[PDB]
Design an enzyme around this catalytic site. Structure first.
Site, short mmCIF file in Angstrom:
data_model
loop_
_atom_site.label_atom_id
_atom_site.label_comp_id
_atom_site.label_asym_id
_atom_site.label_seq_id
_atom_site.Cartn_x
_atom_site.Cartn_y
_atom_site.Cartn_z
N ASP A 152 18.82 -26.05 -16.20
CA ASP A 152 20.00 -26.45 -15.44
C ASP A 152 20.51 -25.32 -14.56
OD1 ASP A 152 23.26 -27.96 -16.18
OD2 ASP A 152 21.86 -28.27 -14.53
N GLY A 162 33.88 -28.76 -24.49
CA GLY A 162 35.01 -27.95 -24.90
C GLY A 162 35.50 -27.04 -23.79
N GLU A 163 36.02 -25.88 -24.17
CA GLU A 163 36.53 -24.93 -23.20
C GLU A 163 36.06 -23.50 -23.45
OE1 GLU A 163 40.85 -23.96 -23.64
OE2 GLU A 163 40.79 -25.37 -25.31
N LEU A 201 38.92 -20.03 -18.91
CA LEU A 201 38.01 -19.68 -17.84
C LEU A 201 37.32 -20.93 -17.29
CD1 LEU A 201 36.48 -16.49 -19.45
CD2 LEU A 201 38.24 -16.67 -17.68
N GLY A 202 37.21 -21.95 -18.13
CA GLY A 202 36.57 -23.18 -17.71
C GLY A 202 36.60 -24.23 -18.81
N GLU A 203 36.62 -25.49 -18.41
CA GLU A 203 36.64 -26.59 -19.36
C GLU A 203 35.47 -27.53 -19.10
OE1 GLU A 203 40.57 -28.35 -20.33
OE2 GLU A 203 41.37 -27.02 -18.77
N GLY A 204 35.25 -28.46 -20.02
CA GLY A 204 34.16 -29.40 -19.87
C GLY A 204 34.06 -30.34 -21.05
O1 LIG Z 1 25.75 -18.43 -21.63
C1 LIG Z 1 27.16 -18.20 -21.68
C2 LIG Z 1 27.94 -19.47 -21.66
N1 LIG Z 1 27.47 -20.54 -22.31
N2 LIG Z 1 28.42 -21.44 -22.06
N3 LIG Z 1 29.47 -21.09 -21.31
C3 LIG Z 1 29.20 -19.81 -21.03
C4 LIG Z 1 30.11 -19.01 -20.20
C5 LIG Z 1 30.90 -19.65 -19.20
C6 LIG Z 1 31.78 -18.92 -18.36
C7 LIG Z 1 31.88 -17.49 -18.52
C8 LIG Z 1 32.60 -16.41 -17.92
C9 LIG Z 1 33.56 -16.46 -16.80
C10 LIG Z 1 34.09 -17.60 -16.22
C11 LIG Z 1 34.96 -17.20 -15.19
C12 LIG Z 1 35.79 -17.90 -14.27
C13 LIG Z 1 36.58 -17.17 -13.34
C14 LIG Z 1 37.48 -17.91 -12.38
N4 LIG Z 1 38.99 -17.81 -12.74
C15 LIG Z 1 39.25 -18.12 -14.24
C16 LIG Z 1 40.75 -18.01 -14.57
C17 LIG Z 1 41.58 -18.93 -13.68
C18 LIG Z 1 41.32 -18.64 -12.20
C19 LIG Z 1 39.82 -18.74 -11.85
C20 LIG Z 1 36.54 -15.75 -13.34
C21 LIG Z 1 35.72 -15.03 -14.25
C22 LIG Z 1 34.95 -15.79 -15.17
N5 LIG Z 1 34.09 -15.38 -16.16
N6 LIG Z 1 32.30 -15.24 -18.49
N7 LIG Z 1 31.42 -15.54 -19.44
C23 LIG Z 1 31.11 -16.87 -19.52
C24 LIG Z 1 30.22 -17.58 -20.37
#
Ligand SMILES: OCc1n[nH]nc1-c1ccc2c(-c3cc4cc(CN5CCCCC5)ccc4[nH]3)n[nH]c2c1
EC number: 2.7.11.1
Length: 272
Positions: A122, A20-21, A14-17
């Site tokens: 942030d 981590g990921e 869902l995301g990297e940084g």
């Molecule tokens: O407080 C919670 C927390 N702490 N740290 N990180 C989080 C954290 C970061 C991201 C998410 C997400 C999330 C990210 C995301 C991204 C997309 C976009 N899509 C992804 C697949 C490829 C194509 C594009 C769609 C739905 C999504 N849902 N759900 N829960 C999270 C918790």
């Protein structure tokens, strides 16, 4: 006592940084989805601690964590709508009614956090997620900290955040109150939702864009695209002196904040 119920399949990143990921995990049996944050360890323990005390509809839920060596796994609420960041059209923003609704929810989440003595530090579109019904949820407490404990406020001094969203006092004073800082970043987020662009690289007199704002040149690009009602609110939020800056209780009394604009999500409809 159902077999396999504790098994989760990592379907996609869902995301990297740097930390981590984050991956989408689906339960082998129930197919329920959750977001799993994977930290390589080599802040994290503090993040877990903060997450464990959170419980609000506009804050990403924390389900638990598993150490398992040097790789921490955080099970978090999966927000299928993605980042608010992706709902903002470059140089355009989004319809005012949508921005107002998102701002209402953002305030709800921030009021909650401040109520339990936690400051996010942030706030920005990348950290504001949306669920299946476009409800906004504040996420990522990796920079969050306690600013009030045993009913005693602790002034902050650590430089945290993201420059375009940071309040001017964080760059000008040694110590500062935590709450006005989160209020300021919410104002920059509002600006972004309504104009599709950030007003300045940073809130410094050396920054021409910022100087123009303090001189009330609202005929300039950023502010010119914003209606007078929401602009009047921004005039109260983006105030340099944090002591004179509007507080959340007063934001809730603002004219634009209470202006009827956004209708329901629709669902029925059939005539005759
Ligand atoms: O407080 C919670 C927390 N702490 N740290 N990180 C989080 C954290 C970061 C991201 C998410 C997400 C999330 C990210 C995301 C991204 C997309 C976009 N899509 C992804 C697949 C490829 C194509 C594009 C769609 C739905 C999504 N849902 N759900 N829960 C999270 C918790």
């Amino acid at each position: 006592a159902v077999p396999f119920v504790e098994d989760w399949d990592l379907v996609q990143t869902l995301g990297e940084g740097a930390y981590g990921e984050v991956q989408l995990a689906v339960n082998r049996v129930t197919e329920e989805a959750v977001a799993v944050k994977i930290v390589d360890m080599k802040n994290i323990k503090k993040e877990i601690c903060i997450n464990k005390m959170l419980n609000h509809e506009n804050v990403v839920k924390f389900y638990g964590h598993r150490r398992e060596g040097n790789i921490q796994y955080l099970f978090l609420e999966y927000c299928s709508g993605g980042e608010l960041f992706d709902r903002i059209e470059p140089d355009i923003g989004m319809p005012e009614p949508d921005a107002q609704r998102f701002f209402h929810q953002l305030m709800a989440g921030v009021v909650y956090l401040h109520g339990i003595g936690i400051t996010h530090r942030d706030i920005k579109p990348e950290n504001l997620l949306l669920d299946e019904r476009d409800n906004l949820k504040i996420s990522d407490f990796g920079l969050a900290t306690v600013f009030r404990y045993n009913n005693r406020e602790r002034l902050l001094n650590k430089m945290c955040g993201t420059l375009p969203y940071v309040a001017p006092e964080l760059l000008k004073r040694r110590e500062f109150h935590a709450e006005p800082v989160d209020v300021w970043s919410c104002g920059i987020v509002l600006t972004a939702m309504l104009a599709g662009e950030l007003p300045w690289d940073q809130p410094s007199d050396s920054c021409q864009e910022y100087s123009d704002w303090k001189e009330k040149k609202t005929y300039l690009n950023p502010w010119k695209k914003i209606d007078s009602a929401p602009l009047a609110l921004l005039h109260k939020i983006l105030v340099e002196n944090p002591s004179a800056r509007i507080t959340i209780p007063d934001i809730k009394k603002d004219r634009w904040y209470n202006k009827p604009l956004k209708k329901g999500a629709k669902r029925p409809r059939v005539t005759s």
